Design a binder for these strands. Structure first.
Ligand code: K
Ligand code: K
Ligand code: K
Ligand code: MG
Ligand code: MG
Ligand code: MG
Ligand code: MG
Ligand code: MG
Ligand code: MG
Ligand code: MG
Ligand code: MG
Ligand code: MG
Ligand code: MG
Ligand code: MG
Ligand code: MG
Lengths: 176, 108, 72, 113
RNA sequence: ACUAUGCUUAGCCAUAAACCUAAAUAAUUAAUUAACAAAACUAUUUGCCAGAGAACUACUAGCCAUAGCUUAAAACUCAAAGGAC
RNA sequence: UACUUAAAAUUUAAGGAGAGGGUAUCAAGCACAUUAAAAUAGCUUAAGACACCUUGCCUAGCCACACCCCCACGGGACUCAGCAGUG
């Protein structure tokens, strides 16, 4: 899970800053305007705002690459929860994989422009970024089986050389 | 195609020129094996004089004998040349009149 | 717009499907043998690698996977 | 202090890999004229460069200097300079940090930090 | 008349005339009628095509596919095949 | 060919700005990398590696070959691909 989940008693984002100013509000009215009587979409508007404050230098701006990345991390985690119940939903499975790919694209542009913000965003959002591999590797049973032997054969050849060196050095040391 | 696509591919690939019955040679020498008649594919009507020959390369081919009347028989030697007989399908060789055993057409 | 070119392909595919039906049993035996040769070629290609590298026996705990057999 | 034999005494390229110890794989590109089209395209070459301090990251523009003697079969250059650091570019004209076509620090200001 | 099947739940299969027979994107409507269709046309990038048949075939490789799919030739034959009116 | 030290002609070795035949139904090669405590796990490749096939090219000329076994200690089927000439 994630460190922060909005509490049920929290007000929606429309009245988040309005109810505190009001001198006295009833418990019922606070409950109607809380996150308990709201849709899941409203709970996501609160999660996004919390992350923007904790990461973005200027939370008022939502068009920065760092803000767009935070908008996609909340959606991605939402789509993942959706797909845990709706295991055979293919439209949302496409939404999940396309948002992940969109986030990776934005993280690439951020890395190339503002590396300092890039490092903070990845650390805070807990997103690992892997660089695109220069060459595409084809995969099939014949290739994966030959590539496994080739790696094993090499390792055996190198292990034998290391043993030979130790024996050769040991013999020389005894002579000295 | 775009200029980038023309660059990545370059000039058109050219299929190799496969050889014909003479194997890219002006003439071949062959020994007659059989003499027979071939019928021209319609709309033509004739009894065209042909012969099977074993060429110097070692293969066997069918050769049209031009002219009105030949004295060719088995075991004779002939000099074949290229050129298809248009009505006779598969006959891609011809015999040269006046060389080796084959002789010039007897003038009437 | 006539369908003549579609009718030529229609007859080719019809006749081809009936040819496969007649010789279905023969084709099955051809395939099982083509896969067996495909497996031997795979094993030999793997033996070439370790022998060229200088090993006299295949790497310890290695058994060439049977990848063309009815494993699935 | 004789200089290298290789033609590329000075080459600029992008660090496309850094998985070898103290070595950075650099991709340089040159313009080559297509004789049929008479248009220039990019021909790219790979250069291994000695990165003594392992101060290189994938994607940064660097300047390589040809070594006098080849260090190894493929390592015949060293890292002269990092022209542009990936995501940490410093505008040459004004000297202020930039993040794309924008100033992270205004050129009017004088932070001196 | 009655089955397989069309239904549900798991997995496979990966093919349609999967065709708006129109790749996507941004312009322009005049300094522009091969025909028909859906007016013409510029630029950018990728894909694709190079006479017809042989051939949605043979061989090769990959695939839960085993009478399968994708990939995809040549010999040889012909002087045409094909589109619109 | 000059000097007790320098101008050429001609080569050899290690290399690389760029260019350089065909087949992609040859798509993976399988040690092909770096460091220098000897560790790290890398290197080449759809911008065509690797494999196979074909071909003398760069033309004041150049390159390879010299009975055959790429070589030639050795071995073998033991020499005109020098001029003329023969089968
Ligand atoms: K006639
Ligand atoms: K349609
Ligand atoms: K030789
Ligand atoms: Mg037919
Ligand atoms: Mg029923
Ligand atoms: Mg299809
Ligand atoms: Mg439809
Ligand atoms: Mg089909
Ligand atoms: Mg088929
Ligand atoms: Mg097949
Ligand atoms: Mg094939
Ligand atoms: Mg010799
Ligand atoms: Mg001789
Ligand atoms: Mg001699
Ligand atoms: Mg002679």
């Amino acid at each position: 899970k994630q460190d922060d989940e909005p509490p049920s008693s929290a007000f929606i984002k429309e009245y988040k800053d309005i109810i505190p100013n009001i001198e006295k509000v009833d418990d019922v009215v606070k409950r109607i305007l809380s996150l308990e009587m709201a849709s899941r979409k409203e709970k996501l508007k609160i999660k996004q705002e919390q992350l923007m404050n904790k990461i973005v230098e200027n939370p008022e701006d939502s068009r920065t690459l760092e803000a767009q990345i935070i908008a996609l991390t909340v959606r991605i985690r939402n789509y993942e929860e959706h797909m845990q119940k709706h295991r055979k939903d293919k439209a949302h499975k496409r939404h999940l994989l396309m948002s992940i790919d969109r986030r990776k694209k934005l993280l690439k542009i951020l890395r190339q422009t503002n590396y300092d913000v890039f490092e903070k965003t990845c650390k805070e959002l807990g997103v690992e970024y892997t660089l695109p591999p220069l060459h595409f590797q084809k995969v099939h049973r014949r290739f994966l089986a030959k590539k496994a032997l080739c790696i094993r054969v090499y390792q055996e050849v190198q292990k034998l050389k290391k043993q030979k060196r130790a024996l050769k050095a040991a013999a020389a040391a005894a002579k000295k | 195609a775009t200029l980038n696509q023309m660059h990545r591919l370059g000039p058109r690939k050219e299929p190799p020129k496969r050889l014909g019955p003479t194997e890219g040679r002006p003439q071949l020498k062959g020994v007659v094996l059989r003499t027979f008649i071939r019928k021209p594919k319609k709309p033509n009507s004739a009894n065209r004089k042909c012969c099977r020959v074993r060429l110097s390369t070692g293969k066997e081919a069918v050769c049209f004998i031009p002219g009105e009347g030949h004295t060719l028989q088995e075991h004779h030697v002939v000099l074949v040349e290229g050129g298809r007989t248009q009505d006779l399908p598969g006959v891609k060789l011809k015999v040269v009149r006046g060389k080796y055993d084959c002789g010039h057409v007897q003038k009437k | 717009k006539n369908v003549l070119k579609i009718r030529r392909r229609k007859m080719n595919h019809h006749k081809y499907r009936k040819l496969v039906k007649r010789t279905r049993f023969l084709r099955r035996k051809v395939r099982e043998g083509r896969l067996k040769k495909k497996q031997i070629k795979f094993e030999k290609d793997l033996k070439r690698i370790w022998l060229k590298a200088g090993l006299k026996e295949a790497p310890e705990n290695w058994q060439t996977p049977k990848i063309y057999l009815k494993n699935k | 202090i004789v200089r290298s034999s290789v033609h590329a005494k000075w080459v600029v390229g992008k660090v496309i890999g850094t998985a070898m110890i103290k070595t950075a794989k650099v991709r340089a590109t040159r313009l080559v004229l297509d004789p049929y089209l008479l248009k220039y395209f990019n021909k790219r070459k790979t250069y291994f460069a000695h990165d003594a301090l392992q101060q290189c990251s994938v994607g940064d523009i660097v300047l390589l200097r040809a070594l006098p003697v080849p260090r190894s079969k493929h390592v015949k250059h060293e890292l002269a300079e990092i022209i542009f650091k990936v995501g940490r570019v410093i505008d040459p004209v004004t000297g202020k940090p930039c993040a794309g076509t924008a100033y992270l620090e205004s050129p009017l200001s004088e932070p001196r930090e």
